Design an enzyme around this catalytic site. Structure first.
Site, PDB file in Angstrom:
ATOM      1  N   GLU A 131      -6.519 -26.806 -14.027  1.00  0.00           N
ATOM      2  CA  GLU A 131      -5.582 -25.921 -13.293  1.00  0.00           C
ATOM      3  C   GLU A 131      -4.457 -25.446 -14.209  1.00  0.00           C
ATOM      4  O   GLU A 131      -3.258 -25.478 -13.772  1.00  0.00           O
ATOM      5  CB  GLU A 131      -5.029 -26.630 -12.062  1.00  0.00           C
ATOM      6  CG  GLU A 131      -6.106 -27.010 -11.067  1.00  0.00           C
ATOM      7  CD  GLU A 131      -5.649 -27.742  -9.815  1.00  0.00           C
ATOM      8  OE1 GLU A 131      -4.404 -27.913  -9.665  1.00  0.00           O
ATOM      9  OE2 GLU A 131      -6.539 -28.166  -8.990  1.00  0.00           O
ATOM     10  N   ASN A 172     -11.375 -26.991 -15.973  1.00  0.00           N
ATOM     11  CA  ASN A 172     -11.661 -27.065 -14.521  1.00  0.00           C
ATOM     12  C   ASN A 172     -10.573 -26.297 -13.783  1.00  0.00           C
ATOM     13  O   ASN A 172      -9.378 -26.485 -14.092  1.00  0.00           O
ATOM     14  CB  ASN A 172     -11.705 -28.520 -14.078  1.00  0.00           C
ATOM     15  CG  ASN A 172     -12.250 -28.714 -12.688  1.00  0.00           C
ATOM     16  OD1 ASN A 172     -13.383 -28.334 -12.417  1.00  0.00           O
ATOM     17  ND2 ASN A 172     -11.487 -29.369 -11.828  1.00  0.00           N
ATOM     18  N   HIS A 208     -13.283 -25.065  -3.696  1.00  0.00           N
ATOM     19  CA  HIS A 208     -12.605 -25.381  -2.408  1.00  0.00           C
ATOM     20  C   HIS A 208     -12.576 -24.123  -1.568  1.00  0.00           C
ATOM     21  O   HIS A 208     -11.614 -23.364  -1.674  1.00  0.00           O
ATOM     22  CB  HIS A 208     -11.211 -25.941  -2.645  1.00  0.00           C
ATOM     23  CG  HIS A 208     -11.250 -27.243  -3.355  1.00  0.00           C
ATOM     24  ND1 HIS A 208     -11.803 -28.407  -2.788  1.00  0.00           N
ATOM     25  CD2 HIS A 208     -10.736 -27.601  -4.553  1.00  0.00           C
ATOM     26  CE1 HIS A 208     -11.657 -29.404  -3.654  1.00  0.00           C
ATOM     27  NE2 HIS A 208     -11.061 -28.912  -4.761  1.00  0.00           N
ATOM     28  N   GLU A 238     -15.911 -29.582  -7.227  1.00  0.00           N
ATOM     29  CA  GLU A 238     -15.150 -30.189  -6.115  1.00  0.00           C
ATOM     30  C   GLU A 238     -15.483 -29.503  -4.787  1.00  0.00           C
ATOM     31  O   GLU A 238     -14.568 -29.251  -3.966  1.00  0.00           O
ATOM     32  CB  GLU A 238     -13.650 -30.166  -6.384  1.00  0.00           C
ATOM     33  CG  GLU A 238     -13.235 -30.502  -7.785  1.00  0.00           C
ATOM     34  CD  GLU A 238     -11.743 -30.675  -8.039  1.00  0.00           C
ATOM     35  OE1 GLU A 238     -10.921 -30.501  -7.090  1.00  0.00           O
ATOM     36  OE2 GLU A 238     -11.396 -30.897  -9.225  1.00  0.00           O
ATOM     37  N   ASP A 240     -16.092 -28.183  -1.327  1.00  0.00           N
ATOM     38  CA  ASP A 240     -15.925 -28.452   0.120  1.00  0.00           C
ATOM     39  C   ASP A 240     -15.611 -27.117   0.784  1.00  0.00           C
ATOM     40  O   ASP A 240     -15.228 -26.150   0.075  1.00  0.00           O
ATOM     41  CB  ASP A 240     -14.891 -29.543   0.411  1.00  0.00           C
ATOM     42  CG  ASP A 240     -13.539 -29.376  -0.272  1.00  0.00           C
ATOM     43  OD1 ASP A 240     -13.126 -28.208  -0.526  1.00  0.00           O
ATOM     44  OD2 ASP A 240     -12.834 -30.408  -0.448  1.00  0.00           O
TER      45      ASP A 240
END
Ligand SMILES: *[C@@H]1O[C@H](CO)[C@@H](O[C@@H]2O[C@H](CO)[C@@H](O[C@@H]3O[C@H](CO[C@H]4O[C@H](CO)[C@@H](O)[C@H](O)[C@@H]4O)[C@@H](O)[C@H](O[C@H]4O[C@H](CO[C@H]5O[C@H](CO)[C@@H](O)[C@H](O)[C@@H]5O)[C@@H](O)[C@H](O)[C@@H]4O[C@H]4O[C@H](CO)[C@@H](O)[C@H](O)[C@@H]4O)[C@@H]3O)[C@H](O)[C@H]2NC(C)=O)[C@H](O)[C@H]1NC(C)=O
Length: 319
Positions: A131, A172, A208, A238, A240
């Site tokens: 990030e 990432n 996400h 990650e 979801d």
């Protein structure tokens, strides 16, 4: 049959899941986390972050990270190690320090060398920097960026490479999975690291996503190929897909279609090595405490029962 067996049949290395140490005392939870038909890979959700591993300067703490590695090792699952350099979950001594370029660089390098050396031979991949971008694709003004400037990114990569030459080094980030200023800037991080002569192997796409606002399979595939064209691998790290509560049959169906498109995009991209969901049961999802009114984001519900998204994933993996 399951997500990981299905993923490997299409040439992915894994289908996997994040977890966190507090959950490893839940036996029914751990039995399904340990089900290698569904999970061939584990990410520690918190215990390899900077606050967990170096809570005071030059004092390293590996017990909780090592517990997750030991579970993966007993089950025959790959590890993704997460994450070396990140603006969030820094211990106080980093965030409160009076730093020069020289003293913060030494502390950053020392963190990386110690943590990477400890986990040498244990990780498929490291999320080296996490990030580093603002949503507009400019550099996030973290303590690392303010004090060191843009060099902190390739320096982090080169320092990780020196300590473990074999592990895949990833950048990432989230909101880099669809065309936009941030994805363009994530491509540019790949290019900048190589211009510095440092090593980058992979781009980690957090994924996400939001139910009914998930990028299409085609938009996701375009972006995956945009990264693999640069001579790196990619992974969804990650995944979801958070829904506006309350849950309904219609929202669960839309969530299934959304998950199916993510898995199918990865399968359609040579160089997409795998998918990791950010835990696997709604019981333990990070989402509801962060995203007001959102939840139920995963392929199993809070009772460890499959939701339609499990079938959507299986369909996207071509099972
Ligand atoms: C704390 O200490 C550390 C350690 O000493 C300091 O680290 C140094 O940091 C420098 C950057 O701040 C870094 O320079 C970069 O080096 C790489 C590699 O260069 C070598 O190899 C290439 C390729 O073979 C060769 O061409 C070179 O001659 C070198 O041998 C370069 O890729 C980087 O080049 C980019 O940035 C420069 C400088 O950009 C700034 O200034 C310009 C003009 O004033 C300005 O227009 C720009 O907006 C910036 O403000 C550009 O001139 C180049 O064109 C490159 O720019 C492209 O890439 C950038 C991303 O990297 C984009 O942002 C840009 O738009 C463009 O697309 C650069 O020269 C040193 O290598 C590094 N040294 C060491 C030992 O690690 C650190 O500075 C220090 N921090 C502070 C705050 O004091």
């Amino acid at each position: 049959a399951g997500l990981n067996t299905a993923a490997k049949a299409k040439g992915l290395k894994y289908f996997g899941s994040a977890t966190d140490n507090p959950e490893l005392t839940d036996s029914a939870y751990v039995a399904q986390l340990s089900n290698t038909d569904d999970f061939g890979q584990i990410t520690p959700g918190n215990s390899m972050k900077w606050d967990a591993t170096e809570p005071s300067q030059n004092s390293f703490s590996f017990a909780n990270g090592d517990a997750v590695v030991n579970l993966a090792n007993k089950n025959g699952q790959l590890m993704r190690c997460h994450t070396l350099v990140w603006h969030s979950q820094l211990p106080n001594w980093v965030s409160s320090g009076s730093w020069t370029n020289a003293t913060l660089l030494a502390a950053m390098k020392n963190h990386i060398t110690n943590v990477v050396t400890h986990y040498k031979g244990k990780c498929y991949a490291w999320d080296v920097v996490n990030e580093a971008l603002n949503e507009d694709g400019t550099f996030r003004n973290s303590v690392f960026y303010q004090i060191i400037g843009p060099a902190y990114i390739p320096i982090a990569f080169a320092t990780a490479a020196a300590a473990d030459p074999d592990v895949k080094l990833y950048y990432n980030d989230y909101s880099i999975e669809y065309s936009g200023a941030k994805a363009t800037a994530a491509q540019n991080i790949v290019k900048m690291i190589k211009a510095y002569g440092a090593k980058i192997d992979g781009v980690g796409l957090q994924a996400h996503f939001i139910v009914g606002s998930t990028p299409s399979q085609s938009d996701l595939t375009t972006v995956l190929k945009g990264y693999t064209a640069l001579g790196v691998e990619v992974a969804y790290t990650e995944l979801d897909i958070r829904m506006q509560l309350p849950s309904t049959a219609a929202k669960l169906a839309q969530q299934s279609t959304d998950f199916q498109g993510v898995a199918a995009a990865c399968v359609s991209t040579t160089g997409c090595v795998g998918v990791t969901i950010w835990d696997w049961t709604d019981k333990y999802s990070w989402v509801p405490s962060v995203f007001q009114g959102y939840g139920a984001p995963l392929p199993w519900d809070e009772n460890y029962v499959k939701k339609p998204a499990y079938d959507g994933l299986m369909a996207g993996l071509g099972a």
